[PDB]
Amino acid sequence: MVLSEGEWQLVLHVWAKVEADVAGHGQDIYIRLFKSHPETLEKFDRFKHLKTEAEMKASEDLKKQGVRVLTALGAILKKKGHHEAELKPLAQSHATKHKIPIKYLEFISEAIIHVLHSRHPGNFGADAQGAMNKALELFRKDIAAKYKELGYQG
Ligand code: HEM
Ligand SMILES: [O-]
């Protein structure tokens, strides 16, 4: 469960394209997440009322939230596995305050992969998607371990 440097470079090469417009990517990822797995939207007290994709796209608060998620995830990815410090606050808030199960982290990982596959075929072929999946699996494995330490089954 340790990524090679070549795998990390495939992850970071597609993430650089995400960074051309992190806000737009965040909107697409949230829309995909909520339309593939509607139950996840219920965890968001401020966004749970959104009824349609048009409302999600027009929500300035949701756009800002997407930027926060992707920027936090980008900082984790750029540590190339040395993300202990970054996972501490994230694991605590998601376990104890938002109460986000591991299955829901799997759902957002799937939404990320789906959106990168659609938007970035030039940097998200099979090998690149495999590397991104490995990076997200590592993130989820380490978050799950921290969840257990914090008292949350997940
Ligand atoms: C890649 C995985 C994720 C990352 C990097 C991430 C990151 C963040 C960050 C940085 C924040 C703001 C600070 C904080 O409260 O920690 C946040 C808030 C939040 N997260 Fe996540 N998150 C992820 C997955 C999820 C998922 C899958 C859900 C629910 C299905 C979720 C639910 C929430 C909620 C409800 C908030 C508070 C939102 C608000 O203030 O309106 N998170 N997340
Ligand atoms: O989030």
From Swiss-Prot:
One of its GO terms (molecular function) is peroxidase activity. The keyword Zinc does not apply. Pfam families: Globin. The modification Phosphothreonine is found at residue 68. Keywords: Cytoplasm, Heme, Iron, Metal-binding, Muscle protein, Oxidoreductase, Oxygen transport, Phosphoprotein, Transport. InterPro entries: Globin (IPR000971), Globin-like_sf (IPR009050), Myoglobin (IPR002335). Its EC number is 1.7.-.-, 1.11.1.-. Nitrite binds at residue 65. GO terms for cellular component: extracellular exosome; sarcoplasm. Gene3D superfamilies: 6.10.140.2100, 6.10.140.2110. The modification Phosphoserine is found at residue 4. GO terms for biological process: removal of superoxide radicals. Residues 2-148 form the Globin domain. It is found in: Cytoplasm, Sarcoplasm. It comes from the Eukaryota. O2 binds at residue 65. Heme b binds at residue 94. The keyword Lipid metabolism does not apply. It catalyses: Fe(III)-heme b-[protein] + nitric oxide + H2O = Fe(II)-heme b-[protein] + nitrite + 2 H(+); H2O2 + AH2 = A + 2 H2O. Belongs to the globin family. Monomeric heme protein which primary function is to store oxygen and facilitate its diffusion within muscle tissues. Reversibly binds oxygen through a pentacoordinated heme iron and enables its timely and efficient release as needed during periods of heightened demand. Depending on the oxidative conditions of tissues and cells, and in addition to its ability to bind oxygen, it also has a nitrite reductase activity whereby it regulates the production of bioactive nitric oxide. Monomeric. This is Myoglobin. It comes from Physeter macrocephalus (Sperm whale). The lineage of its organism: Eukaryota, Metazoa, Chordata, Craniata, Vertebrata.
